[PDB]
Scaffold this active site. Sequence first.
Site, PDB file in Angstrom:
ATOM      1  N   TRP A 269       0.518   8.320   8.765  1.00 53.95           N
ATOM      2  CA  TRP A 269       1.578   8.232   9.771  1.00 53.95           C
ATOM      3  C   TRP A 269       3.015   8.304   9.232  1.00 53.95           C
ATOM      4  CZ3 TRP A 269       0.263   5.369  14.960  1.00 53.95           C
ATOM      5  CH2 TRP A 269      -0.755   6.104  15.591  1.00 53.95           C
TER       6      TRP A 269
ATOM      7  N   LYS B 285       8.909   7.240  17.252  1.00 53.26           N
ATOM      8  CA  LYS B 285      10.161   6.510  16.997  1.00 53.26           C
ATOM      9  C   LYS B 285      11.325   7.083  17.766  1.00 53.26           C
ATOM     10  CE  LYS B 285       9.278   4.451  12.435  1.00 53.26           C
ATOM     11  NZ  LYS B 285       8.784   4.895  11.083  1.00 53.26           N
TER      12      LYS B 285
ATOM     13  N   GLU C 214      -0.249  -5.892   8.523  1.00 53.32           N
ATOM     14  CA  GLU C 214       1.103  -5.485   8.936  1.00 53.32           C
ATOM     15  C   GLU C 214       1.545  -6.348  10.134  1.00 53.32           C
ATOM     16  OE1 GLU C 214       4.213  -4.539   8.477  1.00 53.32           O
ATOM     17  OE2 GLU C 214       3.715  -2.551   7.750  1.00 53.32           O
ATOM     18  N   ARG C 215       2.846  -6.558  10.265  1.00 59.92           N
ATOM     19  CA  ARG C 215       3.430  -7.013  11.531  1.00 59.92           C
ATOM     20  C   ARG C 215       2.985  -6.106  12.697  1.00 59.92           C
ATOM     21  NH1 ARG C 215       9.878  -6.916  11.869  1.00 59.92           N
ATOM     22  NH2 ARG C 215       9.488  -4.689  11.619  1.00 59.92           N
TER      23      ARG C 215
ATOM     24  N   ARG D 211      -5.894   0.840   5.072  1.00 61.90           N
ATOM     25  CA  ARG D 211      -4.962   1.409   4.125  1.00 61.90           C
ATOM     26  C   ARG D 211      -4.698   0.471   2.980  1.00 61.90           C
ATOM     27  NH1 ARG D 211      -2.076   0.447   9.296  1.00 61.90           N
ATOM     28  NH2 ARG D 211      -0.105  -0.650   8.905  1.00 61.90           N
TER      29      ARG D 211
ATOM     30  N   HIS E 221       0.535  -5.652   3.124  1.00 63.20           N
ATOM     31  CA  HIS E 221       1.524  -4.783   3.769  1.00 63.20           C
ATOM     32  C   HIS E 221       2.914  -5.311   3.513  1.00 63.20           C
ATOM     33  CE1 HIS E 221      -1.818  -2.823   5.895  1.00 63.20           C
ATOM     34  NE2 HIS E 221      -2.348  -4.033   5.822  1.00 63.20           N
TER      35      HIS E 221
ATOM     36  N   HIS F  73       0.833  -1.193   0.000  1.00 67.03           N
ATOM     37  CA  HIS F  73       0.000   0.000   0.000  1.00 67.03           C
ATOM     38  C   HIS F  73       0.876   1.254   0.000  1.00 67.03           C
ATOM     39  CE1 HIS F  73       0.846   1.354   4.046  1.00 67.03           C
ATOM     40  NE2 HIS F  73       0.793   0.092   4.433  1.00 67.03           N
ATOM     41  N   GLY F  74       0.320   2.325  -0.566  1.00 64.93           N
ATOM     42  CA  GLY F  74       1.039   3.576  -0.702  1.00 64.93           C
ATOM     43  C   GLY F  74       1.146   4.251   0.645  1.00 64.93           C
ATOM     44  N   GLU F  75       1.801   5.403   0.675  1.00 69.32           N
ATOM     45  CA  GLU F  75       2.024   6.169   1.886  1.00 69.32           C
ATOM     46  C   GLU F  75       0.734   6.340   2.689  1.00 69.32           C
ATOM     47  OE1 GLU F  75       2.131  10.620   2.176  1.00 69.32           O
ATOM     48  OE2 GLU F  75       4.315  10.382   2.144  1.00 69.32           O
TER      49      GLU F  75
ATOM     50  N   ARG G  34      13.066  -3.540  15.449  1.00 70.17           N
ATOM     51  CA  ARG G  34      12.625  -2.961  14.190  1.00 70.17           C
ATOM     52  C   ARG G  34      13.199  -3.733  13.013  1.00 70.17           C
ATOM     53  NH1 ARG G  34      12.079   0.380  10.553  1.00 70.17           N
ATOM     54  NH2 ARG G  34      10.477   2.014  10.637  1.00 70.17           N
TER      55      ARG G  34
END
Lengths: 241, 240, 241, 240
Positions: free
Chosen positions: C16, C100, C89-90, C62, C184, C11-13, C116
Site C-alpha cells: 500500500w 488519502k 498498527e494504530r 507485514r 509497527h 516493518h519494511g515497505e 493523521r
Amino acid sequence: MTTYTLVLLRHGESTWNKENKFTGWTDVPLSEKGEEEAIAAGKYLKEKNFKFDVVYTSVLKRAICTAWNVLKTADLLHVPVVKTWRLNERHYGSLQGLNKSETAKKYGEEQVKIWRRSYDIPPPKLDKEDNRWPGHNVVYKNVPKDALPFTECLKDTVERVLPFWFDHIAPDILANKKVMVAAHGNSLRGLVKHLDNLSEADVLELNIPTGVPLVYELDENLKPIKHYYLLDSEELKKKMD
Amino acid sequence: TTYTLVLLRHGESTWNKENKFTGWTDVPLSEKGEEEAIAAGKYLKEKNFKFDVVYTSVLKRAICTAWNVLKTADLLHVPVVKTWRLNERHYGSLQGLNKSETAKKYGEEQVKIWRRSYDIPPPKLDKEDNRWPGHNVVYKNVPKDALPFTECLKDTVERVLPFWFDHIAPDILANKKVMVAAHGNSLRGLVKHLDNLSEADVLELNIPTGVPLVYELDENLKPIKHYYLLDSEELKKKMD
Amino acid sequence: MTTYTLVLLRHGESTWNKENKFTGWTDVPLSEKGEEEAIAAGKYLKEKNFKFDVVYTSVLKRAICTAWNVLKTADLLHVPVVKTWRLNERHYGSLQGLNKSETAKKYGEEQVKIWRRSYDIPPPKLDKEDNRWPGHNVVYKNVPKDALPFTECLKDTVERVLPFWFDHIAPDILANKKVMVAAHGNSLRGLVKHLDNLSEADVLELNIPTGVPLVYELDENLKPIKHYYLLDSEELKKKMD
Amino acid sequence: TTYTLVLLRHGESTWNKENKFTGWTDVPLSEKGEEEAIAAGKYLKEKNFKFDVVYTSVLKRAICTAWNVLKTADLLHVPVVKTWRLNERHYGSLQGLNKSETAKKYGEEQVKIWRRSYDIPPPKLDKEDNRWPGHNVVYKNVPKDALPFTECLKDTVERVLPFWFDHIAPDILANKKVMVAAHGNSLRGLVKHLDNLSEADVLELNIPTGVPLVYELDENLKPIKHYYLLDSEELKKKMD
C-alpha cells in the site's frame, strides 16, 4: 561458583493411615496430625529463611493442603501453585479402597508384598467401567482420559513423574527460582531416584518421612552437592519409620 | 446460551474492626471474613456450581476466600491464578491510617472525596515511602513503573480490564467455568464493563461480601442477567 | 554493573505504500522491497552477533513476515514467536481502505491532518456492522470482540500497547532474555514514548524508519542508557524520511 | 462428532540428495521440500481447513513447512509452538554420515537394523562429541540430561507422548483446530497411540511427505477415521 536450592516435602499423615486401607489416588484429607505436620514444616521453613517462587503439587487434596499450610504459615500465600496429576501417589489398581490384611487373606501374604514392595510388578489393573477409574472423576476432567493409569508400579510412577521435572520443575530451578515440591512419597521417590541417580535397589530401600522438608543443594548441571532434612535431630530420629 | 460467571468479593479483613484503610496493605481475613467465604462455598456446592479455573488477586484476604470456597465445595484440585491486576484499589497515603488520624491530617471533607469519587485519587506515595508497592518483594517480578503510588476507582478499572481481556474473557469463551474471588473495587471494574455502566452508576453500586454474584452471558459476553445466589431477604440485610 | 539489550524493528515497505490508501489494521503483505528490508536487517543482526530468546509481533502479516525473514537470515528459526493484536498498527477508523487525496477532498485538508498527525483526536469510528470491523475477521476469532477498536488515535494505541509491555515484554527483559519486537511504527512509538518518557510533543515528532533495527540499552530498572540504529551512516541518512 | 486433527510431515531436506542421515542435524528444507509444504497449503485452503494452533519441532525443515502452509492458506496470525519433543528421531553416530561411509564403518547389515527396528538404537554419542544436542544452544533451556545421545523409534515415541498428553490433546479437547507439522518418526509416535497400533504395525507404516493426514476423532479422542487429503492415485505414487 553457583548453587541452587530445591525443597521436597512429603505430606503428613492422612485419615487412612490409621485405618490400613490401600489409598493410592483415593482422595483422602489430611488428619488433625498431618495438618500439624505441614504447619510445623512451614514454621521451620520461615525460621530458617527459605523463600519460594513456585510450588508444584499433585492434584490430591492431601498434598494441596500441605503446600497451602506451609505457605500460610510462611506468609507466602501470593506464591503461584501448580497442580499436576503427574505428581500423584503411585496408583494402587484394584487394591484401592481395599483393606491391607483382608487382601493378605484373599491372596498370598507374599503376593501383597511384591505388589507393595517391589519396583516393577504392578497390582491388578482396574477396569475403565469401575467407579475408581480416575477418568470418571471430574478432578481429571481436563486431562485426556488415556493418560490415566488403571494401575501403577513404582517404575510407572517414576516414568510419569520425570517428564514433569524436565518440562517444568527443572527449567524453573535453571531459571534461578526457588521451588518447593509438595507431593507424595512415591512421586518424590521418582524425583530423588533421578537426582541421586539411584539404582532400582536403593530407591526401594528409601523411606521419606512425612511432614519433613528435604533440602537438595544442586550445581549448575542440577546434580546434587548435598541433601539434608530440616528438623531437630531428636524428632528426625523418631520420625524415621 | 451458557457461560455462567461467578464473582465473589472477600469478607472483612482484621482492619475493618480497627477502621484502618487497607488498600494494597496485605492484611489477613478476619475470622468473620473467613466464615463468609465458607458460607459462599456451602451455597455454591448446594447448587452444584463447579469451576474449571479460579482468578484472584495477590492479597491474601482474597486468596483465602478462593481457598475456603474450594475446600468447602471440594474443588481443591482447580487451578488458581493470582494477579496484581485484581488487587484492591490502592489507597495512597491513607494506608495504615484509621478514620480518626485521617480526619486529623486532611479533614473529613477531603476524605469523603477520596472515598466517594471516581476521578480523584488520595494523596500519592513516592519511592521514599515504605508503603510503595515497588519495595514489596510480592511484586519483584513486575516492572516497578507499572505499580501505583495511589489510585481512584478509574485507575483501578483501567489496570483490571487488560486482565479481563487477556485472560478472564478468553477462558469464558473457551467453555470454562470461572470464579473471580477478589475485592469490591476490582470487581466493580468487571461489572462496569459487563453491564455497560456509567461513572455515575459504578459509584451507586455496593457489592456485598460473601455472596456469590452470578452472571449469565450470551455468546458475545453480554449479560443476559445476573443474580445473587443467596436468600431473598438476607440479601437485602447484607447490602448495609 | 548490568545492562539489558532490546531490539525494536519496524516493518519494511508494503504493497500500500506505493498506493496512498490509509491502511491501519488492513492486512496488506510486504512488497518485494520490504521483504528485502527484513532480510537485510536480519543480515546486519547476524553479522553483529545479536541473538534472540523471544520475538514479539503484531498479528498483521507485514510484521510477521519481517520477524520471520530476520530469524531465517539470522538462523534462529527455532526462536519462539508471540503474536499480539496489542502490537498492531494504530487503527484508522472509517478511513481504512480509503484514498488519502480523495479523503482530503471529501473533507478539509486540515481535517485529515488532525486525524493523521495529532495525538488524541481519532478519525470517525467504524460501525460494528461494517465489514472492516476487526471483530468479523477470524484473525481475531480468539479475542473478546469488545477489545477491538472501531477507531484509534495514537494515545489509544499507546494505551493498548503498554499493558503488553508490562505483562510480557518487560518481565522477559527482566528475566535476562534478549528480545526483539518486530511491530509497527505507531505501536513502536508507544513503546519508546514510555522508554524515553517522551511528552506528547516529542513522540509526534518521532519518525521510525522502516526495516532499520533500533537497539535500546537498558539498566536494571529498564530505563535507557543509550539507543542506536544498526545501519551504515550513508543508508541511515537516506533512510531518514 | 467434531475434532479434526491434521498431521503434516515435512518434505525432503538438502541432505536427502546427499544421502546423509540427518536425525537432529538442523538441516534446511530442499527447494522440493519447500514446494510440497506449499502444495499442502494450497490444498488445505481449497477445502477451507482452518487452524487455531500449530505444533512443530525445533528443527527448521519442520518449522518452514508450518510457515509455508500458513502463508499459502493466509493463516499467518496463528500461534506456532515449537518443542524438542516433536524432533525427528535421533540418529546417534550416523548423523552427518552418508549411506556409503556408514557401510564402510558398521557394515550394511548393522545399519538396516538401526534403520528398520523399533528397539535397537544406532551407536550412541557422548559428551566429547560435538553432535551432542547438549552442546547446541538451540537447547540451552532443557536440562541436558533430558537430551538423547542416540534413539530408536521407541525412545522417540516415549518422549513424544508427554507432549501429546500435556498440550496437543487438551487443545483438541478445548474445541481447537490443530495441525502438527513435524517428522515421519515423531508423527508415527502420534499415530501409534491414536490407532492403537502394535510395534509391528508401526514399522510397516510410511507417511508420505507434503500430504495432509486428517484424523476425525470422537469425544474421547478415538479415531472415527483418517484420510489423506490428496488425489486418489497421486496418493499411491507418493508412498514410494
